[PDB]
Every structure is written in C-alpha cells, then in structure tokens.
C-alpha cells in the first residue's frame, strides 16, 4: 500500500474548487496516505515551501523547482443585472491587479478605484453574491453565482482574453516518497480534459 | 461625511458568512469609507492585532482589548459511517478535544483523521465533493444537499456542543468615526428581532 502522510500547500482558491475533487479521487485509490492540507496566499505557500511535498499556485513557475501547468482561467466582469457601484478588490500580485484596473479604465467610465479589498478570492466573491458591490472574477470560482440577479461579460485587453495560470510544484527529489508520486501522476491526468 | 479606511481581521470563516452581510449594511450607509478585509486563523489575526481596527475572531476573548460576544453556532455532523475518512479542520485544541471526544463516545471506533485541512470552508467543500465526513458549525451549513446528506446534531451530555464569536477592539479606537461607526452597527446586526 501507499501510506505516510502527504502535506499540500495551496493557493486559498485551489482549496475550494479543485482540491476537494482531486482529493475525492486521492484517497479513494490511496486510503491509507493521511493528508494535510494547508491554504494561503501564493507567496505565502512559495515562502514556506519547505513545509510542503507538493504546491499548487497561481500565476508563474516556481523558481528551483519541477512545475507543472495545470489550467487557464478566463475571467468575467460580474454585475447586478455600475460605475457607481462600489468594485470589490482582491489581492494578487500587481501585473495581475494592474491588468484588472487598466480593463475597468479602458471599459469603464470613471477611473478605477477600489472601495473595498480583501485578500482571498473567495472572500470577493461571497461579496458579490451578498450585493456588497461588482467585481471581476476568475471563471474557476463563478459556480452558484445566480444567472437571474447577475450579469456575466467576459474581460479581454485588445482581443486576448485576461487568463491565469496554475501550476503545481515540487522538488523533483520528493517524487521517491511514493504517496508524493502517487499524487503528482494522479494530478498529471485528472488535469487532462476527455474532450480536449 | 464619515470615511477613512477601516481595517478588518477576521476569521477565515466569518469573512466568508457574517462579514459580507455586515459590509453591505456598512458600505450602503457610510459608502466614503475604505474597507480593508484580512481574513486567517484566529491566532493569526490575534497575533497581527496591530494591522486591524477591529477583529472578529473565534473563541475566547481577547487580551486587552474591548470584547463583545457576538453569537454561538451549534454544531452538526454531517454524513451521506466509520469507515469513511473523517476531515478535521485546524482550531484551538480544547474545541478539536470535544469533537475527538464525542467521535468517540458516539461512534464505535477510535478518532482519526485521514484529511486535515487549515479552513472550515475547505472542510465544507470537502464535504460536498465526497471526500468524506465531518463536523460543521451551523453557520457553515447553506447549500448543503439536504437529499444526499444527513445531518445530526452535536451534544455531549445533552449540552450543544456550540463556539462563539468576538469582535474585539481597542476602546480608544473609537475616536475613529469610521470604527465607531462599525462597532456600533455590528452592535445592531448581531441582536436578532425575534
């Protein structure tokens, strides 16, 4: 059997989306590895990497270490179905935020200005859902916003999509912990789509 | 005419259920104030109590600082039953005792966890998705299947296993319009018309 124990570091909005259906699939077929989950902000992960066997953040490869690309969100510009609505910030790294703010400008009235910030994504969104204000949101996290009170319109700068990356990282040494191997190939496929 | 910045630390959780309720009230009747919104573990935000007007922690008290109890969540366990992989979430440990404890008064093998994670919102979501079973608090509850879940409340010696909630302040901070100004709105929010 697989066993010992396997320690996750991830961003706070991998944690409730796709890590839960990885997990479902994790332990089904490794019963006997026992987990630790930890969640964060991606520099918060990247700093305490060495708590982790494995992480999974959001925006660039990780320096001195294996990566893996994992996905691409779009993103939507979500409001009431606006300029003087109060717009819901999040943190992120700033070419990130930066992009955000330059597309409210160009396609926007006003300048940009945040009346409120929060620091994880689904803090925002939850925001949003209780009429706090109007916000952009990755599309991995747009599950269970109601279709009947929100609009949804895609944002892309020129004519590009705004997208992120996930990745997955880990010491290439670690893959000799067979639970860690175990997980890294489990990932490897379960982020492969059926109808590519 | 009220506005500055307030600056929130709170419990992952609450920043996620009573937060965003209160800031609606909040923005709509005092919209020229900045809202900074920290979220993490209630040491955390105990520790970096510094950085925040006001904290919203769970618990106990806080040292120094003014405290109001603001309510109390029951708790549930929640199934689709011992040999499925039970999740823990991070807390205190005379709190995660009592779950421990009552796993194994009421159910017939020895507490383990299988999967431990940092939130109680990760712990929902792994819930929801399959990946085993767990112990919420009430307030964690919404948007559960009530046709592909059980739910079966929490007591040890016939007292509700229950947690509260704080929102804790220095009194001298009051002086700042925009944090009187929450404090006595979450004052408001917190008292329940029936």
Redesign the interface.
Known sequence: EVNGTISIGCS?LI???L???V??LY?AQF?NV???????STEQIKANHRDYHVMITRGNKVMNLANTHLFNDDHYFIFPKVTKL?FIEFQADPIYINQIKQWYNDNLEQDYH???????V??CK??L?????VTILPEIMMK?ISKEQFEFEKVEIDNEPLIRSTFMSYDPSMLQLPQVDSFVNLMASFVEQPKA
């Open positions: 706070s944690g409730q989306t890590l839960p259906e997990l479902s332990n019963p026992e987990i630790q989950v930890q969640v964060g109060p945040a009346t409120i910030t929060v620091d994880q689904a803090t939850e925001m859902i209780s009429g706090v204000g269970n």
